[PDB]
Write an enzyme that holds these catalytic residues in place. Structure first.
Site, mmCIF file in Angstrom:
data_model
loop_
_atom_site.group_PDB
_atom_site.id
_atom_site.type_symbol
_atom_site.label_atom_id
_atom_site.label_comp_id
_atom_site.label_asym_id
_atom_site.label_seq_id
_atom_site.Cartn_x
_atom_site.Cartn_y
_atom_site.Cartn_z
ATOM 1 N N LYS A 17 0.816 -1.208 0.000
ATOM 2 C CA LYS A 17 0.000 0.000 0.000
ATOM 3 C C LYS A 17 0.854 1.265 0.000
ATOM 4 O O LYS A 17 0.533 2.238 -0.681
ATOM 5 C CB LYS A 17 -0.941 0.006 1.207
ATOM 6 N N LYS A 36 13.250 -0.975 -1.937
ATOM 7 C CA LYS A 36 11.871 -0.717 -1.539
ATOM 8 C C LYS A 36 11.507 0.757 -1.699
ATOM 9 O O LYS A 36 12.036 1.614 -0.992
ATOM 10 C CB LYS A 36 11.651 -1.162 -0.091
ATOM 11 C CG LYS A 36 10.305 -0.773 0.490
ATOM 12 C CD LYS A 36 10.206 -1.158 1.959
ATOM 13 C CE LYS A 36 10.030 -2.659 2.137
ATOM 14 N NZ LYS A 36 8.777 -2.994 2.893
ATOM 15 N N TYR A 86 18.767 -8.827 -0.183
ATOM 16 C CA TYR A 86 17.893 -9.663 -0.995
ATOM 17 C C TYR A 86 17.839 -11.095 -0.471
ATOM 18 O O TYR A 86 18.858 -11.780 -0.395
ATOM 19 C CB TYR A 86 18.349 -9.653 -2.455
ATOM 20 C CG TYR A 86 17.655 -10.681 -3.321
ATOM 21 C CD1 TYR A 86 16.278 -10.653 -3.497
ATOM 22 C CD2 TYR A 86 18.378 -11.673 -3.970
ATOM 23 C CE1 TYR A 86 15.639 -11.589 -4.289
ATOM 24 C CE2 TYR A 86 17.749 -12.613 -4.764
ATOM 25 C CZ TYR A 86 16.380 -12.566 -4.920
ATOM 26 O OH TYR A 86 15.747 -13.498 -5.710
ATOM 27 N N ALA A 87 16.637 -11.532 -0.106
ATOM 28 C CA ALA A 87 16.406 -12.895 0.354
ATOM 29 C C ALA A 87 15.704 -13.706 -0.732
ATOM 30 O O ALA A 87 14.493 -13.584 -0.917
ATOM 31 C CB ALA A 87 15.590 -12.892 1.632
ATOM 32 N N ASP A 130 5.309 -6.475 16.342
ATOM 33 C CA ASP A 130 4.611 -7.724 16.059
ATOM 34 C C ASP A 130 5.272 -8.443 14.891
ATOM 35 O O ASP A 130 5.760 -7.808 13.956
ATOM 36 C CB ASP A 130 3.133 -7.470 15.759
ATOM 37 C CG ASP A 130 2.926 -6.615 14.524
ATOM 38 O OD1 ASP A 130 3.789 -5.760 14.237
ATOM 39 O OD2 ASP A 130 1.897 -6.799 13.841
ATOM 40 N N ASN A 135 6.318 -11.048 7.013
ATOM 41 C CA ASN A 135 7.529 -10.264 7.207
ATOM 42 C C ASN A 135 8.724 -11.125 7.590
ATOM 43 O O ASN A 135 9.703 -10.630 8.147
ATOM 44 C CB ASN A 135 7.296 -9.200 8.276
ATOM 45 C CG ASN A 135 6.205 -8.220 7.892
ATOM 46 O OD1 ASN A 135 6.038 -7.888 6.718
ATOM 47 N ND2 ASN A 135 5.454 -7.752 8.883
ATOM 48 N N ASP A 148 10.545 -6.541 8.827
ATOM 49 C CA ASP A 148 9.417 -5.613 8.902
ATOM 50 C C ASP A 148 9.820 -4.259 9.470
ATOM 51 O O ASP A 148 9.070 -3.287 9.361
ATOM 52 C CB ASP A 148 8.298 -6.203 9.753
ATOM 53 C CG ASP A 148 8.792 -6.693 11.091
ATOM 54 O OD1 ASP A 148 9.956 -7.140 11.156
ATOM 55 O OD2 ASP A 148 8.026 -6.630 12.075
#
Length: 251
Positions: A17, A36, A86-87, A130, A135, A148
């Protein structure tokens, strides 16, 4: 210190979003990383500009294999860009919706990698808001990574939804919810309604399926205590019989 011209933008790894995350390669070093993008107007409209600011500050001081690395950041400033590790093997969320359930070995190993990362965090006095499977990324060797920057109520502790104060015991509640979802395939308090999920969390109202074993039930029951003080320590979780007997990773 960087610019969008420094990177070659690849395919979108995920859409969100607030923005999107693309695969990217730094031109000067051919370095594969995750980029990102985040629109500034949206961060201001939700007022999370400062929370994002602080979370980036906290994330930079973190260095752990089970935590997604944050290389750097910059803006143009039409959008905000985050240079991320990068994963390759994607999120645990997709792995979960691909295998439905996780075996006890895969589950305990993930919990161990989480506990180690969180134990490293608690040592540096940084807590986690959380933890969602969404994440949780996976490295090239399949190692679990938190991504996250958090330093739906499905993963929120009772003390955190009741408006009460919260401490480091939040993360141990998250481990209980994650461990359950890994074994069962769904959060202990999943529902069709926010208001109802609220009730099941506050009451700690959940049940175990038939296939989840004792020791797995034992750990989850100890982690999902309503009173935070009753929740164990990450050192105790890592030494839990069920964990140490199924975990493929050491502390």
């Amino acid at each position: 210190q960087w610019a969008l011209e420094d990177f070659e933008i690849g395919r979108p790894l995920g859409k969100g979003k607030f923005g999107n995350v693309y695969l990217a390669r730094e031109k000067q070093s051919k370095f594969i990383l995750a980029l990102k993008v985040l629109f500034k107007a949206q961060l201001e409209k939700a007022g999370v500009e400062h929370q994002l600011r602080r979370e980036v500050e906290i994330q930079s001081h973190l260095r752990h294999p089970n935590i997604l690395r944050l290389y750097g950041y910059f803006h143009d400033a039409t959008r905000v860009y985050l240079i991320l590790e990068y994963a390759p093997l994607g999120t645990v969320y997709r792995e979960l919706q691909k295998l439905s359930k996780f075996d006890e070995q895969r589950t305990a190993t993930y919990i161990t990698e989480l506990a180690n990362a969180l134990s490293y965090c608690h040592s540096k006095r940084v807590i986690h808001r959380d933890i969602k499977p969404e994440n949780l990324l996976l490295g090239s060797a399949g190692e679990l990574k938190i991504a996250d920057f958090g330093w739906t109520l499905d993963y929120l502790p009772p003390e955190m939804i009741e408006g009460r104060m919260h401490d480091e015991k939040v993360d141990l509640w998250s481990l209980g919810v994650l461990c359950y979802e890994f074994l069962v395939g769904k959060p202990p308090f999943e529902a069709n309604t926010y208001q109802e999920t609220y009730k099941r969390i506050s009451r700690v109202e959940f049940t175990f399926p038939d296939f989840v074993t004792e020791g797995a039930r034992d750990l989850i029951s100890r982690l999902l205590k309503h009173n935070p003080s009753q929740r164990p320590m990450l050192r105790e979780v890592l030494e839990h019989p069920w964990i140490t007997a199924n975990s493929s990773k050491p502390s």
